[PDB]
Amino acid sequence: FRKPQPFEYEGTDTGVVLLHAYTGSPNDMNFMARALQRSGYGVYVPLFSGHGTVEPLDILTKGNPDIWWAESSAAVAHMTAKYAKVFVFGLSLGGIFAMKALETLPGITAGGVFSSPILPGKHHLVPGFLKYAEYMNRLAGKSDESTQILAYLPGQLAAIDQFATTVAADLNLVKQPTFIGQAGQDELVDGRLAYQLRDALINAARVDFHWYDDAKHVITVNSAHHALEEDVIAFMQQE
């Protein structure tokens, strides 16, 4: 099994921070990052604590939203020191942190979310996590771990939501152009709620909203990802 590392591509004028999903990793962003590289952008994809090991508990015991928010904000600072212009995008978990960056951190031109409505809702992250843990354990030949996972998972999902609601409450503070991409057959979060993310952004310079009709959640990797790439790059060019 291979631990995904953080990775960076050098650019010239404009740089992009890509923040990955819960139970995900920098691999979430492999196509996207490279799409951006082919169009001359710099790209940085950090790894969130707890993520990217063979052991799913590490996410629950070594990571939390406050740590991941520090790491997101360090990743933005890395890039804003370097590039004239910096965009920040995030998938699911990473999207929350991307929107909080736009709300609270200096020096960002624009940014947005892939499949991350922010507003907490009806989600399927409990089955998703366990299924993930189940695959990872099968892979490593480690005995099921569902019981110890269920001692933490509710807790950490709660902390995520709590973090999210603060971000939702501060959506009024966003003045930047904001990209929203949402999967149209999202099996993990409630895509509906992306329309409400749209409507809450009452002070944003624009909101560029896209809906990817037949795609499941991880639209950075699945069949939507070519369209998503086109749309994100057209978004950035427009600004």
List 72, 115, 186, 208, catalytic entry: 186
Strands 207-212 and 178-183: parallel
Active site residue 186: yes
Phi and psi angles of residue 165, each rounded to the nearest 5 degrees, phi first: -70, -30
Kindly give, in sequence order, each residue whose CB lies less than 8 Å from that of residue 110, ignoring residues fewer than 6 positions away.
87, 102, 176, 177, 178, 179, 235, 236, 239
Place of tokens 């409990």: 126
What range does the domain containing 239 cover?
A: 1-239
What is the Cα–Cα distance from 20 to 70, expressed in whole angstroms? 14
List 25, 92, 115, 116, catalytic entry: 92
Number of separate domains in the chain: 1
Using alpha carbons, select from 125, 126, 120, 108 the residue that is nearest to residue 193.
120
Place of tokens 């710099």: 42
Do residues 73 and 101 touch, judged by C-beta distance below 8 A?
yes
Do residues 10 and 42 touch, judged by C-beta distance below 8 A?
yes
Kindly give, in sequence order, each residue whose CB lies less than 8 Å from that of residue 116, ignoring residues fewer than 6 positions away.
90, 91, 92, 93, 94, 95, 96, 98, 99, 189
Q: Structure resolution in Å? A: 2.2
What is the Cα–Cα distance from 32 to 35, expressed in whole angstroms? 5
List 20, 51, 210, 217, catalytic entry: 217
Active site residue 49: no
What is the Cα–Cα distance from 238 to 221, expressed in whole angstroms? 24
- Please report, for the domain that includes residue 48, its CATH number: 3.40.50.1820
List Cα–Cα distances, 128 to 41, 153, 215, in angstroms: 33, 11, 16
Mapping DSSP onto H, E and C, the string for 164-191 reads HHHHHHCHHHCCCCEEEEEECCCCCCCH
- The structure's method of determination equals X-ray
216 Cα distance to chain centroid: 15
CB count within 10 Å of CB 38 equals 9
